[PDB]
């Protein structure tokens, strides 16, 4: 019995609305303020999701908060890509049921280039024929893909946990394939996909940080948790104190 998968499927977060007023014009202020609220809302689900993951509670409470604070961007973008793929077939960015981005909004949000990259990520799910099980194991692995260069409180258990989630992904690939070249080819493709998430998350990190600094001048509201994490944790990533863990060099 696939205990691990049972857990991942059982704890997968449901639908989250942004609360966007689709009646008012597509302004930068409105679009970004709603994206910020969506983030605040999804942050709640990411925390509950993570705490329910196999072995996560073995991490020191401070490390638990740390990995979530550093990896949320990538986690949310990856799940959004999956939603877009399965809903609008990756043709539009399905941030939330009430906040779907078309080309016009991509331009209005002033993050069109970033949206293009997210669309590409979304299309990869289709191009690679990623299964729901692969998606779930890969997403779980993204939580363990960014840490401080100086290490975590109990780095050793984080290392064991990360290793186990890699083992589970490899297992999911092999649990559906007999050929070694196929398994090896698939593992290569998926680790490459995971790596591609980081550059995108990085651009969004830089973008949201800059936006926070002058949010008062462009009329963009940042919720409490988002504001705290973006001014305290994000700068640690942008300054090089916290770095992603890539599979490939």
């Amino acid at each position: 019995q696939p205990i691990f998968l049972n857990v991942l499927e059982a704890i997968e977060p449901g639908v989250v609305c942004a609360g966007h007023d689709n009646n008012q014009p597509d302004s930068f202020a409105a679009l970004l303020s709603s994206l910020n609220e969506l983030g605040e809302r999804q942050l709640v689900h990411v925390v509950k999701w993570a705490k329910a993951l196999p072995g996560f509670r073995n991490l020191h409470v401070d490390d638990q908060m740390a990995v979530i604070q550093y990896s949320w961007m990538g986690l949310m973008v990856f799940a959004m890509g999956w939603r877009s793929f399965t809903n609008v077939n990756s043709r539009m960015l399905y941030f939330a049921p009430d906040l779907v981005f078309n080309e016009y909004r991509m331009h209005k949000s002033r993050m069109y280039s970033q949206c293009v990259r997210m669309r590409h990520l979304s299309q990869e799910f289709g191009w690679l024929q990623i299964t729901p099980q692969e998606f779930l194991c890969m997403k779980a692995l993204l939580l363990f893909s960014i840490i401080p260069v100086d290490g975590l409180k109990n780095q050793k258990f984080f290392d064991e946990l990360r290793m186990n989630y890699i083992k589970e992904l490899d297992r999911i690939i092999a649990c559906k394939r007999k050929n070694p070249t196929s398994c090896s080819r698939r593992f290569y493709q998926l680790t490459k996909l995971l790596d591609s998430v980081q550059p995108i998350a990085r651009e969004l990190h830089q973008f949201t940080f800059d936006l926070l600094i002058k949010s008062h001048m462009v009329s963009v509201d940042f919720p409490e948790m988002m504001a705290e994490i973006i001014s305290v944790q994000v700068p640690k990533i942008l300054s090089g104190k916290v770095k992603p863990i890539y599979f490939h060099t």
Binding site: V44, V47, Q64, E224, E228
Partner: peptide
């Protein structure tokens, strides 16, 4: 802090 309350 809603964040700490989220873990607490």
């Amino acid at each position: 802090s809603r964040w700490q309350a989220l873990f607490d």
